[PDB]
Symmetry: C4
Subunit: 431 residues, 4 copies
C-alpha cells in the first residue's frame, strides 16, 4: 500500500528485544535466502517505499537497533548465499578478527544514507542513540574523523574564534557619536574598525544563509524545532540579530547596538557548539541545551509566578510618603535570588510587619523553589542524564562528520577507506 515490501514490515515488527529481534532476524535471513534462490537477478534489499527508504534505511531511521546491527554485520558461510552478505572476514585470530564491511548505502543512497537518517532523525525514535556504537558505523565515523574531518572541524572552530574576536573588537571600538551610519576617518584604526565590521556582517550573512539552507534541507516539523536543530537555531538567531543590527545601523537608529550586543553575546555562547563533539567538554554544553529546552520552562514559570505575585503584593503595600513601580519591586525581589536582597530596600509603607512577612515568605518560598529544582534535577541523575549526554556527544560527532563530508570544499567526494577490493562493494577494512 505504501510501496514497501516484506522487509520493511520486518523492520517495523522489531522492538529491540532479544526474542523479537531473533524472530525478525530469522525471518529476514530466510526470506532473503529464498528470494535470492527464486530471483537471483533482483536486488532484494534495494526496493524503496514511498518515503524512499530501503529496509536498511528504514531500520536506521526507525530506531531498530537489533535489525540494523544484524544487517550491517551480516555474514554468510555457505554456498549459493555468499552474495547476500555484507561482512567478509579476512583474518581470524584469537583476540583480533580482521574483516571487510560493505559501505554501499551507508555513505550514500543518492537520497537517504544510513548515517544521514541516523544523524538527522527526529530524536523521537526508541533508541537511535546507540546506533553509532555498531562496529562498522563506529569505526567508519572514527576513521572519517581522524582522517580529514578532525582538522577541518578544528579549522572551522579557529575561524569562528577569529570571527568572534574581530566582531568583539569592532563592536567594542564602535564610535559613540549619534545617528549612524558613521563617516570613516583617515586614521588606520578606523579602517581596521570598518574592516572588522564588514567581516562581522559577512559572517552574519554566512550564518543566515547557512541557517536557511539547513532549515530548507531538514524541514523541521515545528514541534521538534528546538528539540533538534538547537545549535542551528542559535546560530540563525545570532545572524538575525546581526542583520537587524545592519538594518538599524543604516536606518539611522542607535538601537542597532541593542541588536549587535545580543548577537555578540550569542556569538560567544555559540562557541559551545564547537565544544560539543568533545568527549569531556561537550557534555557540559549538551547539559546546558537540555536544561534550557526541557527543565527551564517549568522552573521559570513557577519562579516568575512567585516573583510577580510577591512583587505585586509588595508594590501594592508600599506607597509614597523610588521603588513605587512594579518593575523596581520585581528587581528588588529578584535580587534575593542572587544573594543581594536588601530586605529593607524601602520604608515607604504602613504595616512594616506585613512588608517584612511578605519578603520573608518570598525568601523562604524562593529557596524552597530552588531546592525543589535541585531535587527534581537530581532525581534524574541515576544513569539517565549522563547516558543521554554521552549519546548526544556521539550524535554531534556524527553530524559534524556528515556536514563536513557534504561540504568537502575540494570538488572531490571520494572519502572511502579500502576502495573496491566482480563485487565492487566499496569495502571497509576493520581490524
Amino acid at each position: 500500500s505504501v510501496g514497501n515490501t516484506v522487509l520493511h514490515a520486518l523492520v517495523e515488527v522489531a522492538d529491540n528485544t532479544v526474542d523479537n529481534t531473533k524472530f525478525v532476524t530469522s525471518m529476514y535471513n530466510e526470506i532473503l535466502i529464498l528470494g535470492a534462490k527464486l530471483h537471483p537477478t533482483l536486488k532484494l534489499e534495494e526496493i524503496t517505499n514511498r518515503k524512499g527508504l530501503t529496509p536498511l534505511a528504514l531500520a536506521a531511521s526507525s530506531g531498530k537497533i537489533g535489525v540494523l546491527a544484524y544487517i550491517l554485520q551480516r555474514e554468510i558461510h555457505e554456498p549459493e548465499c555468499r552474495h547476500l552478505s555484507r561482512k567478509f572476514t579476512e583474518w581470524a585470530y584469537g583476540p583480533v578478527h580482521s574483516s571487510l564491511y560493505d559501505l554501499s548505502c551507508i555513505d550514500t543512497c543518492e537520497k537517504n544514507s544510513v548515517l544521514e537518517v541516523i544523524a538527522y532523525s527526529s530524536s523521537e525514535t526508541p533508541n537511535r542513540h546507540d546506533m553509532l556504537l555498531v562496529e562498522p558505523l563506529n569505526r567508519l565515523l572514527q576513521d572519517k574523523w581522524d582522517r580529514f574531518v578532525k582538522r577541518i572541524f578544528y579549522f572551522n572552530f579557529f575561524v569562528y574564534c577569529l570571527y568572534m574576536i574581530i566582531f568583539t573588537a569592532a563592536a567594542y571600538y564602535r564610535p559613540v557619536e549619534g545617528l549612524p551610519p558613521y563617516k570613516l576617518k583617515n586614521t588606520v584604526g578606523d579602517y581596521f574598525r570598518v574592516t572588522g565590521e564588514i567581516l562581522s556582517v559577512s559572517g552574519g550573512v554566512y550564518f543566515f544563509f547557512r541557517g536557511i539552507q539547513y532549515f530548507l534541507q531538514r524541514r523541521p516539523s515545528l514541534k521538534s524545532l528546538f528539540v533538534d536543530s538547537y545549535s542551528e537555531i542559535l546560530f540563525f538567531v545570532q545572524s538575525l540579530f546581526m542583520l537587524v543590527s545592519v538594518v538599524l545601523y543604516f536606518s539611522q537608529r542607535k538601537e542597532y547596538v541593542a541588536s549587535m550586543v545580543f548577537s555578540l553575546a550569542m556569538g560567544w555562547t555559540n562557541m559551545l557548539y564547537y565544544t560539543r563533539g568533545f568527549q569531556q567538554m561537550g557534555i557540559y554544553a549538551v547539559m546546558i541545551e537540555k536544561m534550557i529546552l526541557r527543565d527551564l520552562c517549568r522552573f521559570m514559570f513557577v519562579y516568575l509566578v512567585f516573583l510577580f505575585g510577591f512583587s505585586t503584593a509588595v508594590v501594592t503595600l508600599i506607597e509614597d510618603g523610588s521603588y513605587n513601580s512594579l518593575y523596581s519591586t520585581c528587581l528588588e525581589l529578584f535580587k534575593f535570588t542572587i544573594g543581594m536582597g536588601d530586605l529593607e530596600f524601602t520604608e515607604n509603607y504602613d504595616f512594616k510587619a506585613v512588608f517584612i512577612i511578605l519578603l520573608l515568605a518570598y525568601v523562604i518560598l524562593t529557596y524552597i523553589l530552588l531546592l525543589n529544582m535541585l531535587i527534581a534535577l537530581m532525581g534524574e541523575t541515576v544513569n539517565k542524564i549522563a547516558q543521554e549526554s554521552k549519546n548526544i556527544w556521539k550524535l554531534q560527532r556524527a553530524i559534524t562528520i556528515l556536514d563536513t563530508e557534504k561540504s568537502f570544499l575540494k570538488c572531490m567526494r571520494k572519502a572511502f577507506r579500502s576502495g573496491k577490493l566482480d563485487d565492487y562493494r566499496w569495502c571497509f577494512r576493520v581490524d
Copy 2:
C-alpha cells in the same frame, strides 16, 4: 456485622501482593459463579455495607489495587456465567485487542463511584496512587480529558488569570488617601478601579463559597486536612484574606491593605494549582506542596532555634554606647542565610572576639543546617519523590475531571463513550 457480605471480607484480605491477590481473585470468582448459580435473580456485587460501599467501591477506596484490577477487567468465556463479566473482548488481533468495558458503578453509583473514592481517598491507603493506571480507568479519564474537560479546565485557568490580572490592577491602583472607603470619582479610571475591585471581591466570595462547599461535601478529618485538600485550603485562605480586606475596608481601617496584598500574593501563587495536571510543569507545584507540608516544619524549627539562640546571644552581648532590639538582631542574623550578612553590623559591644565568634559559629552552623537539609532531601530522591509526584499529578488530573463532570454547566450529565450497546451496561470501547 457491619451490613457487608463475603466479598467485602475478600477485599479486606488482599494486601496488594501476588499470592494474596491470586488467592482473593480465585475466591471472588468462585463465590460469584456459585452465587449466580444459587440466586440467578440477585446482583451479588450490588450489596452495600454500612458505609454505602460495594465490594468494587471498597476495593477502590481501600487501596486494594489487585482486586480492583481483576474486577474491572474481569472476563468470562463459558456458558451460564457471561452475565457476571465486566470486560467483553470483541476483536483479538496481534497488536490490537478491541474490547468493551463496563462503566456501571465507575461513573456513578448514586452515592460513591470508583473514580470518586479513588480521587477523594484519605491518601493513607496502600496503593491508590497507581489505581488510575488500570486500563479502563486510565482510558476513561484520558477520554474525559481530551473530550470536554481539557477545554473547560483551560477556560477556568484563563478566567483565573483574568481575575488575578484584574485584582492586581485594582490593588496596584488603589487610592492612597486615608481612612477608607473611598468615594467614587467621575473620572473613568476610578470607574475601572471600582469595577475591578467589585470583580475581585466577587471572585473572593466565589472561592469562599466553593471552599465551604468543598469542606462540607468532603468533611476533612482535621488530621489529614492539609495532607489532602491543600490547594482548596490555599484558595479558601486567599478568599478569607479577601473578605477580611473587605470588612476592614468598610470598617475604615487601612489594615485592609495588609489583608489584600496577602490575598494578592496568595492568588498569584494559587496559579500553581492550575499548573498541576500538566505532566511536566505540575511536578514542580506538587514538590512545593510536599516540601511545605512535610519537610518545612523540621528545617524551620531547627533553623529558628539556632537563629533565636544566636540572636539572643548577640543582642545580649551588644549594649548601647540601632540593633539593640532582638528583632533587629534576628534580621541581621537572617541576612546571613540570604548572603547579605554584614558580619560587622554593629560595634556597640565589648568583647569583639566573643561577638565575632558567635557570628562565625552561627554562620557555620546555619550552613551545616542547610547542608543537612539538602542531604536529607537528596536521600529521598532514589526513585521515590519523582514517582510520588507523578502519582499526585495523575490524581490531580482525575480530581479535575471529577470536579468538572460534577459541575457540567449545561444541565446535562451524560458523558458516556459507547452508550447502551438486552445488556445495557454503558459500554466503553477500548482498542
Copy 3:
C-alpha cells in the same frame, strides 16, 4: 579464664550471619536442654562473667543481634523443656498471635539489663542499632513511652523551654552598668530580673551535676567521648559556661557576659536534644551532630588551610600607603564564603593583577572546596545516612525511656505490663 561459661562463648561465635546464627542457635538450644537435663536445679543463663554480663546481656552488649533475637523470642513446645523458654504463646489466630514474653533480665538484672546495655553501649558494636526492633524490646519500649514516659518527656521539654525563656529574659534585661555584681532596685522589674537570674543559675547547677552524674555512671573512655554522650557533653558545657559566668559575675568582671551569651546560645541549641526522639523532626538534630563529629573536622581543616594561606598571601601583598592586619584580611576572605566578598576591599597594594589573581584563585578554590564537601556528603546518601539517622532516633527514644525510668520521681519503681502471672516471670503480653 574470664569467669564465663559455654553460653558466652556461643554468643561470641556469632557474627550476625545466617549460617553462623543458625549454628549458634542450634548449639544454644541443645546445650540449654542438656544442661537442664543434667542440672535441673540450676539456672543455666544466670551465670555472669567477670564483667557481670549474662549470655543474654553479653549478646545484647556485644551487638550480636541474631542471638539476642533468638533468645528473647525463644519458645519451647515439648515436655521436660518448657521451663527453659521465654516466649509463651497463649492464642494463635490468623492475623494475630497473642503471647507472653519474659521481662526478667530485660528491665533489671540489678547490675546490667538488656535495654541498659543496648542503649549505653559505646556504639562501636556491629548492629546494636536494629536490636530495638526485636518484638519484645520494641513493644516494651513503645509501651513504656505511651504509658508514662511520653508525658514526662514532654514535661521536661516544656520545663526546659521555660528555663530557656527565663534565661533569655534575664540575660536580655541584664543591667548595663559597669563592674558587677549589681545592687538590686526596688522596682518590681529588677526583682523579676534577679529571680530569673537565680533560676538560670539554678538550672545551670542542675545540668552541671546531672552531667557529672552521667559521666561518673558511664565513665566514657575519652576516645568515644564525643561519638556518644554528645548531647550530655553539650548540656554540661552549657552549664560550665553558666558557672564560669557566675564566677566572673561575682569576681567583678564584665567578661561574665562573654560566658553567659555562649551558655544562652548553647542552651537554645540544646533544645535540639529534645527534638531527637521524634521520628521526623529529630532527624536534623541527629544529622547535625554527626556532621559536627564526623564530617566537619576535615572540611574545616582544609578550608582554614586555604583561607589562612590566601589571607597571608593577601596581607603580605597589601601595604599601607585598614586591612593591614592578618585578622582583617581573614575576615574579608571569609566574607566570600557567605556571598559578601567585596573583591576590591582595598587598594593599598602594588601589583593589582596579583591581588585580583589571588582573590579569584581563592574564590574558585573555595567554591571547589564547598562543591567537594557537597559531593563527598552526597556520596554517602545511598541508604547510609538516612538509616543511621532513623537508628539513632530509636536509640535516643530508648535512652530517654531508660533515663526516665531510672528517675521515676515517685519512689515507685514498678512499671511492668502484665505482672507476676508457680513461674512468676514478669510477663509482657504482645498481641
Copy 4:
C-alpha cells in the same frame, strides 16, 4: 622478541576476569612445576625482559590484580615442588592462620620492586588501585607505617608546618621600603626576619632540588604529567615561585613580592599533601586534586565563554556620558557568581531594557551553568568518586612509605619483619 619468557606473555593474557584469571593461574602453576622438573638449578621467575621486569613485576606494573594475588600468595603442599612456593603456613587454627610470606622481590629487586611498580605506575593501568589490598602487600605497608614511617611522616609534616610558619612570619614582616635588597638592621627583629627569609629560601631550594630529583627519577611522559605527580608538581612550582622571588629580590624589583605571596599561598595549600595519609581527611584533598585536574577545565571554559561573551556585550552597550573597560565589566559580571552582583552597577548606557535583559540572561545562564556542573558531578557519585578517592588515598600512603624507605636517613636499609628464618626468603609473618 622483547627479551622475555613464556611467563611474561602468560601474565599479559589476564584481564582481571574470573575465567582468564583461573586459566592464567593453572598455566602459570604448570609452567613453573615443569620448568623446575626440567631445570631444577634455574630460577624461573627471575628472568627480566628488556624493561627489567620479572613476571611478578610485570603483573604488578600491568595492573593484573588476579595474577599478582595468586603469585604473591602461592602455596604448594606436594613433594618436589615446595621450593616454588612463596607463602608458608606455620599455624592453622579455626579463625587464625599464621603464615610466612616471601618478601623477596617485594621490597627490592635492585631495579624494580613490586611496591615500586604498583605505586609509581602511570595510573592508566586497569586495576593497580586495589593491588595494595593484597594480604602480603597490605600487611607489609601497614607494618612499615606503624613501625617507623608514621613518626617520620608526622615529623616531616611538623617540619613543613614550621617552615610555612617561618615563611609566613618573614613575608608578613617584610620591610615596606622601596627597591630591594634591604640592608640588615642591628635590631633583633630584623635578625629574626633575615633568619626567617634565609630559612624560607633554603626550604625553597630544598623543594626545588627534590622536585628535580623526582622528575629525573620518574621522567613523566608530559601527557600524564598532572594526573600523577600532581603534589610534586605543586611543590616544585611553589619552589619555583620562591626562587623567582629570590631573583627579583636581588634584581632590585618589588615584583619579588608578587612571586613570594604565590609561593606563600601555594605553600599553605601544599599542606594538603600531608593531609593525604589520613583515612578521613585525605579524601578531601584527593577530591580537590581530581576536581581541579578532571572537571575544572571544561567548567571554566564554558563559564569563561559565557562571562566573556556577556561582558563584551555589556561593555559594548555602555558608553560614557567608570566601568567603560572590558576588565571592569568582567569583574562586575563575575560578582554575580559570588552573590555580590549589583545588577545596576552603571547607568552609562542607552537602552536600559537591553542592559537589564543581558544581565538577567547572564544570571540565569550562569546559575544554569552551576546547576549543570553540580548535576554532572553528582551523576558520578554512585560509588565511583568515593571508591577512586579511597584507592588514591591507599596509593598515596604506599608512595609515602616507599619514599621514606628510600631516604632512611640512617645509612641503614634493612626494614624486614622476620628476617632469614636453609631457605633465606626474608620471611614476613601474618597472623
